[PDB]
Amino acid sequence: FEFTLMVVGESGLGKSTLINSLFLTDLYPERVIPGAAEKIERTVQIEASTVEIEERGVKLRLTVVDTPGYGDAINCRDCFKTIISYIDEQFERYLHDESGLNRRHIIDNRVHCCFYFISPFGHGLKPLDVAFMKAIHNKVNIVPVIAKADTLTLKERERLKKRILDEIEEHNIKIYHLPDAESDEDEDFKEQTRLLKASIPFSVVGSNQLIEAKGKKVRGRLYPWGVVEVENPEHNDFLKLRTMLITHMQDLQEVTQDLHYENFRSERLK
Amino acid sequence: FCFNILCVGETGIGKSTLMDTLFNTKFESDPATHNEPGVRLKARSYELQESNVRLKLTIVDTVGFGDQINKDDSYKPIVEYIDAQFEAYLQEELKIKRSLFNYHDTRIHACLYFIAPTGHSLKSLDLVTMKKLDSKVNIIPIIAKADTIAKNELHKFKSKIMSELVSNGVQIYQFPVHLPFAVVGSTEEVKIGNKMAKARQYPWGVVQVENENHCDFVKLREMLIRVNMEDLREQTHTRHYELYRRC
Numbered sequence: 375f376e377f378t379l380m381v382v383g384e385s386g387l388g389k390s391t392l393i394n395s396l397f398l399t400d401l402y403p404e405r406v407i408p409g410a411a412e413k414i415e416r417t418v419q420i421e422a423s424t425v426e427i428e429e430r431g432v433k434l435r436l437t438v439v440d441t442p443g444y445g446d447a448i449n450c451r452d453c454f455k456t457i458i459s460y461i462d463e464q465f466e467r468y469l470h471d472e473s474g475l476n477r478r479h480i481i482d483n484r485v486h487c488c489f490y491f492i493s494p495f496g497h498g499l500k501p502l503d504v505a506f507m508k509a510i511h512n513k514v515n516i517v518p519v520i521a522k523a524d525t526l527t528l529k530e531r532e533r534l535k536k537r538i539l540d541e542i543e544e545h546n547i548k549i550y551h552l553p554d555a556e557s558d559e560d561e562d563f564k565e566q567t568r569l570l571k572a573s574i575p576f577s578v579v580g581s582n583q584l585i586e587a588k589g590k591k592v593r594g595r596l597y598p599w600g601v602v603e604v605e606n607p608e609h610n611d612f613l614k615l616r617t618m619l620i621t622h623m624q625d626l627q628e629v630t631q632d633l634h635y636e637n638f639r640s641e642r643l644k
Numbered sequence: 645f646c647f648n649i650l651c652v653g654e655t656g657i658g659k660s661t662l663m664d665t666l667f668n669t670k671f672e673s674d675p676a677t678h679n680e681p682g683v684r685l686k687a688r689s690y691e692l693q694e695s696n697v698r699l700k701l702t703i704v705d706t707v708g709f710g711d712q713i714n715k716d717d718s719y720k721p722i723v724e725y726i727d728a729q730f731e732a733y734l735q736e737e738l739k740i741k742r743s744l745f746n747y748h749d750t751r752i753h754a755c756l757y758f759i760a761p762t763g764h765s766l767k768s769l770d771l772v773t774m775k776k777l778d779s780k781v782n783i784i785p786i787i788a789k790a791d792t793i794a795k796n797e798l799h800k801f802k803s804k805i806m807s808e809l810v811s812n813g814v815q816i817y818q819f820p821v822h823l824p825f826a827v828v829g830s831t832e833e834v835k836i837g838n839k840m841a842k843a844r845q846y847p848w849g850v851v852q853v854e855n856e857n858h859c860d861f862v863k864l865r866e867m868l869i870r871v872n873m874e875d876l877r878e879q880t881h882t883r884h885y886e887l888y889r890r891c
């Protein structure tokens with residue numbers, strides 16, 4: 375099975391680091407970060423990297439669609455056109471392919487999920503964040519992510535999460551909602567779904583560095599005052615985000631097909 | 645006596661917190677929303693004692709900087725304020741019966757430019773704004789919320805920032821520690837040893853504001869407030885104001 379994950383957010387929020395942390399990949403070996411003068415009028419480009427992931431015993435084709443340039447320019451007016459056009463184009467190709475006679479070999483390139491990285495440095499969502507999510511929330515499953523969560527104390531983290539949730543509701547933004555746990559599922563799975571839901575939006579830390587979490591070399595970030603552990607759920611939500619994505623990949627695909635694609639398809643009629 | 649500090653920085657980047665920490669008090673620090681239609685400025689004046697010296701301190705903060713989708717001309721309201729204080733001083737000099745000794749100087753003597761800790765270099769808005777300000781005010785670039793940057797990232801990030809300032813010809817204030825200052829602010833206290841210290845408490849450790857191995861706050865407070873206050877005023881008068889006065 376193929377899964378396509380789009381990544382959007384201001385440059386410098388640790389997005390490439392988190393993405394590589396999720397799957398132990400190296401998707402950006404030749405990435406060049408432009409200088410400030412080059413970013414004044416930078417345009418958004420689409421870059422797609424496809425890798426084979428064999429988590430547990432299941433192998434899957436993961437495509438990460440990055441949007442370098444998003445938010446870089448002084449005037450970010452058309453910072454959405456190229457992204458929106460890419461999402462709709464994949465819907466367009468699928469519609470042509472499923473209506474044709476070669477339905478047997480359809481490559482599904484529809485975007486199944488969008489990680490939107492929110493800066494932890496402000497007080498809440500910024501006008502650019504709100505406008506982009508409102509521009510795509512009827513087309514893709516939005517998963518909002520608080521970047522660089524190790525910049526926030528616990529109280530600051532609770533305050534920012536609560537405000538982001540309030541603003542999503544205030545602006546009528548539709549983000550992806552996890553399916554409710556069925557009654558036939560055992561207790562420790564229902565509590566698992568509840569714990570994941572309670573931590574949205576996930577506040578995550580990523581790292582490509584091995585540090586000393588006294589007793590063992592683990593993923594983290596070293597400061598003069600201590601060490602943040604990527605996989606410590608008491609430090610950040612990386613494991614919840616990872617578990618959420620792996621557990622709900624199939625549901626994310628099905629919502630893309632049953633909701634966003636069908637709404638594109640009916641809205642398509644001239 | 646009189647000292648006017650301009651804080652330029654994105655919404656929530658820590659301007660009010662850093663000023664409270666720098667002067668060890670609580671100024672007016674009402675947060676802005678992210679929905680301001682454009683950049684405006686908030687000015688507040690305070691009477692403080694900074695050692696022995698009667699200090700009439702004015703703090704001018706940007707409001708809404710970096711928040712709009714279209715960030716064109718974000719520098720203009722800042723330059724307008726700076727130029728207005730230049731013009732007020734010039735009008736004082738052109739009075740017939742005048743008393744420049746009595747005059748409360750409102751010109752910005754120091755601009756703290758808060759750089760968001762991306763870990764890359766400068767944002768386009770940072771470059772454009774600092775270039776528009778560098779002949780009008782003593783720019784002191786600082787890395788805000790510097791506890792964001794790991795030990796193994798700070799030196800490279802500082803060097804990338806300076807390289808951008810040099811290659812783009814941004815004139816920054818030269819004081820008569822590796823620059824730019826990487827600062828942490830906090831009005832909260834944590835017990836460190838047997839004393840209560842301004843600090844930020846994380847599940848994994850405590851960032852101490854006055855620990856020079858944690859951040860450059862002590863060096864900023866030393867250079868800006870304890871040492872070079874008179875030089876910043878004089879450079880304002882003899883260089884930046886003189887450029888305005890020449891036309």
Ligand SMILES: Nc1nc2c(ncn2[C@@H]2O[C@H](COP(=O)(O)OP(=O)(O)OP(=O)(O)O)[C@@H](O)[C@H]2O)c(=O)[nH]1
Binds near residue numbers: 653675
């Ligand atoms: N990680 C980190 N967080 C900080 C630091 N200083 C302040 N903060 C946090 O950031 C929040 C925002 O700080 P403010 O001082 O209100 O930022 P501001 O620039 O004055 O924001 P506006 O007035 O709205 O433009 C504070 O309440 C602190 O929780 C810091 O040095 N490091």
Ligand SMILES: Nc1nc2c(ncn2[C@@H]2O[C@H](COP(=O)(O)OP(=O)(O)O)[C@@H](O)[C@H]2O)c(=O)[nH]1
Binds near residue numbers: 384578
């Ligand atoms: N504080 C913090 N810094 C991070 C984190 N992840 C990455 N970084 C650092 O942030 C800087 C930019 O990260 P990068 O992944 O390139 O950001 P991107 O531009 O959004 O892809 C680098 O110096 C990283 O080492 C994190 O979780 N917390």
Ligand SMILES: [Mg+2]
Binds near residue numbers: 661673674
């Ligand atoms: Mg403030």
